[PDB]
Amino acid sequence: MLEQPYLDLAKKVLDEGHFKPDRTHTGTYSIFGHQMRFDLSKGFPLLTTKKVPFGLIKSELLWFLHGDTNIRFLLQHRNHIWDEWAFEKWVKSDEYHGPDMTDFGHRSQKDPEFAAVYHEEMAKFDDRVLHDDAFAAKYGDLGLVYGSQWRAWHTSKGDTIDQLGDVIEQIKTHPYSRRLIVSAWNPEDVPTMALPPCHTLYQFYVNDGKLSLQLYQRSADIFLGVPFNIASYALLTHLVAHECGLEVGEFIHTFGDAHLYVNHLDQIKEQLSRTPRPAPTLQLNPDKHDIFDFDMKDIKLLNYDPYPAIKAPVAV
Amino acid sequence: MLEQPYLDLAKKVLDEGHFKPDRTHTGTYSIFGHQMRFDLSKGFPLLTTKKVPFGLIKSELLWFLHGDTNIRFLLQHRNHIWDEWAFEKWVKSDEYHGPDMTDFGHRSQKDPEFAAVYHEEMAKFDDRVLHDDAFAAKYGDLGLVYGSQWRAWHTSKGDTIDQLGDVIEQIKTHPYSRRLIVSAWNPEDVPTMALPPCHTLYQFYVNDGKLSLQLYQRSADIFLGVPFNIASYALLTHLVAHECGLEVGEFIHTFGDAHLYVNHLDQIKEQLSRTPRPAPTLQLNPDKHDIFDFDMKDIKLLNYDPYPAIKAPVAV
Ligand SMILES: C#CCN(Cc1ccc2[nH]c(N)nc(=O)c2c1)c1ccc(C(=O)N[C@@H](CCC(=O)O)C(=O)O)cc1
Ligand SMILES: C#CCN(Cc1ccc2[nH]c(N)nc(=O)c2c1)c1ccc(C(=O)N[C@@H](CCC(=O)O)C(=O)O)cc1
Numbered sequence: 289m290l291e292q293p294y295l296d297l298a299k300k301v302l303d304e305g306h307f308k309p310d311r312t313h314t315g316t317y318s319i320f321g322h323q324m325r326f327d328l329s330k331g332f333p334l335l336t337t338k339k340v341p342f343g344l345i346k347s348e349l350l351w352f353l354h355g356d357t358n359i360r361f362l363l364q365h366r367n368h369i370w371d372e373w374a375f376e377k378w379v380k381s382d383e384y385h386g387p388d389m390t391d392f393g394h395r396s397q398k399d400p401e402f403a404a405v406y407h408e409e410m411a412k413f414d415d416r417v418l419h420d421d422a423f424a425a426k427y428g429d430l431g432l433v434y435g436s437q438w439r440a441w442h443t444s445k446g447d448t449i450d451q452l453g454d455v456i457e458q459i460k461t462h463p464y465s466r467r468l469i470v471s472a473w474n475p476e477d478v479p480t481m482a483l484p485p486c487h488t489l490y491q492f493y494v495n496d497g498k499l500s501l502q503l504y505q506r507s508a509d510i511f512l513g514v515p516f517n518i519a520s521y522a523l524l525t526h527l528v529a530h531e532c533g534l535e536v537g538e539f540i541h542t543f544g545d546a547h548l549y550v551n552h553l554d555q556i557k558e559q560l561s562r563t564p565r566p567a568p569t570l571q572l573n574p575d576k577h578d579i580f581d582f583d584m585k586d587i588k589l590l591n592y593d594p595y596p597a598i599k600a601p602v603a604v
Numbered sequence: 605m606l607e608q609p610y611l612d613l614a615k616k617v618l619d620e621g622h623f624k625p626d627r628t629h630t631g632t633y634s635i636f637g638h639q640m641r642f643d644l645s646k647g648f649p650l651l652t653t654k655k656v657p658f659g660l661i662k663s664e665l666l667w668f669l670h671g672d673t674n675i676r677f678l679l680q681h682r683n684h685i686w687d688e689w690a691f692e693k694w695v696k697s698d699e700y701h702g703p704d705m706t707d708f709g710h711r712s713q714k715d716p717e718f719a720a721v722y723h724e725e726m727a728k729f730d731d732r733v734l735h736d737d738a739f740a741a742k743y744g745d746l747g748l749v750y751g752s753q754w755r756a757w758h759t760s761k762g763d764t765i766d767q768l769g770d771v772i773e774q775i776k777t778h779p780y781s782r783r784l785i786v787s788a789w790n791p792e793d794v795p796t797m798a799l800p801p802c803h804t805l806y807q808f809y810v811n812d813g814k815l816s817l818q819l820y821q822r823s824a825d826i827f828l829g830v831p832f833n834i835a836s837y838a839l840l841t842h843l844v845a846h847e848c849g850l851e852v853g854e855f856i857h858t859f860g861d862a863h864l865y866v867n868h869l870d871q872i873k874e875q876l877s878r879t880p881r882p883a884p885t886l887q888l889n890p891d892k893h894d895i896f897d898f899d900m901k902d903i904k905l906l907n908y909d910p911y912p913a914i915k916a917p918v919a920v
């Protein structure tokens with residue numbers, strides 16, 4: 289059924305992945321090299337075997353599409369996928385006051401009592417970013433995320449290349465190039481990088497009315513990472529295709545290091561004893577059009593009938 | 605037998621490729637998305653069904669590995685894979701004298717009589733680049749090729765990032781990152797680009813002594829392009845692996861637009877009536893070591909037993 293590529297991967301890892309020590313200690317079973325496909329005219333790859341939140345991944349996506357770096361947008365649409373970072377930018381400066389922030393989430397899922405001091409420290413700052421403007425302006429900014437990457441690349445003669453923008457106009461302009469590419473890997477930077485872009489590069493291809501997209505992703509967490517990345521890039525594609533007036537073909541995903549966390553071997557097994565239910569569908573607001581002004585109500589998802597959800601340890 | 609991935613692709617295109625007009629008019633049958641693998645401990649992917657020249661692709665590779673852009677190196681090791689470009693840089697300036705260069709190779713494979721005026725114009729300049737220094741210095745330079753891309757990325761505060769260099773030291777330093785990446789797509793540039801890097805990105809992965817490499821290539825010519833690209837990236841890998849003291853696992857190739865030229869449908873068929881002979885082998889000079897000073901005699905290839913070769917029209 290559409291999402292079966294992930295199960296064939298989830299299996300295949302558990303099954304022939306090597307034990308690698310990751311950037312922490314956490315065991316990972318790994319595959320290097322895999323490509324996987326989904327025919328978006330037949331449906332949406334939200335996994336129906338583990339409920340995934342659409343509201344969460346759409347808000348983040350649009351905030352990417354808005355060239356926005358500031359962690360505030362998200363806070364307005366109670367999304368918290370990017371906070372932990374701004375906190376290190378915050379706890380590290382000369383203004384941080386009070387406590388032992390000195391690790392916060394790395395001793396949350398097991399700790400101390402951290403969740404009353406890390407999460408109160410955290411809510412106080414998340415609450416601050418949402419109201420104090422000079423504050424927002426200060427720590428909530430994050431810098432180089434995919435929004436700045438995609439919509440305003442930094443150039444060698446001080447400007448800003450809206451790489452994406454230009455690639456959607458390149459589609460209208462002529463269907464055919466092997467050059468409809470939006471990179472997010474900037475070699476200059478990855479010295480001073482927080483989280484390097486995982487979903488390192490992509491490419492679009494028009495072909496007789498079906499748009500398609502290929503994503504090269506340096507690494508995958510096949511439990512928490514991959515369910516949300518397969519969807520983000522499918523919403524982008526439905527959104528990029530409706531802007532330059534096309535219809536939608538497939539989505540193709542290519543990973544460098546797909547790996548599943550040694551913490552998560554139990555929990556995948558749990559999904560693998562499930563048996564898929566049909567794919568959800570997606571209404572794309574048909575009067576609205578310059579996709580950078582898609583507002584959240586313009587992407588209403590229909591028919592999402594998921595299984596219950598599984599409990600992960602944090603990917604450290 | 606090792607090279608069978610290409611035949612399964614060559615077939616598969618002829619067989620389910622769409623007719624696309626390319627950047628010229630030339631018909632192409634296309635596949636978008638494919639990944640293909642070769643276990644370099646079992647041999648070398650020089651096609652034994654169409655003789656491919658190793659001498660040619662090694663010289664070019666080392667000149668890449670030397671951060672060299674100047675078309676001269678090549679001329680010394682009678683390689684001509686990059687001349688046509690320097691000629692447009694040459695014919696376009698205020699110094700070009702004499703003739704109708706006004707298209708040269710685009711009316712060579714069918715023309716005029718071009719091959720006496722284009723090829724004499726061309727040999728006169730190829731001969732000039734090899735001796736006139738201020739000349740070499742002038743038109744033979746080419747600029748942004750993979751050598752400048754890989755060994756000296758241009759930075760926003762006027763310097764030079766030896767991206768590759770740093771990635772081979774990252775291997776010695778620690779086997780494991782999902783961050784052993786050398787991009788060659790610089791969004792700033794591809795306005796003013798001659799030929800954008802086709803083999804857009806790659807990534808290495810150590811895993812218990814086998815190094816491996818994954819190449820994302822925006823487009824492929826599955827007749828002339830692909831035979832030489834599968835090898836270039838396998839020599840790099842044998843060369844990158846012997847430098848940071850590893851052994852060699854697989855090579856994985858991922859293409860955006862693989863396509864085979866409509867001119868070449870006859871000629872692939874010809875290869876497909878052949879039946880492979882075992883894979884060649886490769887001696888990597890075992891006293892020599894900082895791979896940027898690999899000289900050509902240090903990569904002696906052993907056992908190359910090819911079929912005869914097929915005749916292509918130029919990929920325009
Ligand atoms: C997403 C995104 C971008 N990001 C950034 C980000 C940065 C480094 C990473 N590192 C690793 N190894 N894997 C990741 O998933 C990851 C994600 C995320 C941020 C937070 C969450 C998160 O807290 N939510 C989990 C929920 C699972 C659970 O706790 O029950 C999620 O899957 O969303 C996920 C992704
Ligand atoms: C290689 C490389 C980099 N390059 C640069 C380069 C630039 C644009 C391109 N455009 C397209 N569509 N395909 C290409 O192979 C190609 C190659 C090359 C330059 C010259 C030759 C060439 O003249 N030699 C062919 C020989 C086939 C024949 O004529 O019999 C070859 O395959 O080498 C090939 C590649």
Ligand SMILES: O=c1ccn(C2C[C@H](O)[C@@H](COP(=O)(O)O)O2)c(=O)[nH]1
Nearest residue numbers: 311486507508509513514781782783
């Ligand atoms: O939404 C996301 C964000 C991150 N990652 C990953 C995969 C790797 O485990 C790590 C990024 O690579 P490293 O930094 O460990 O090299 O975080 C994902 O899978 N999905």
Ligand SMILES: O=c1ccn(C2C[C@H](O)[C@@H](COP(=O)(O)O)O2)c(=O)[nH]1
Nearest residue numbers: 465466467627802823824825829830
């Ligand atoms: O060694 C090389 C160099 C170039 N190309 C290609 C593939 C495409 O046909 C074209 C580059 O893409 P476009 O410029 O047509 O988009 O040249 C290869 O296959 N191999």
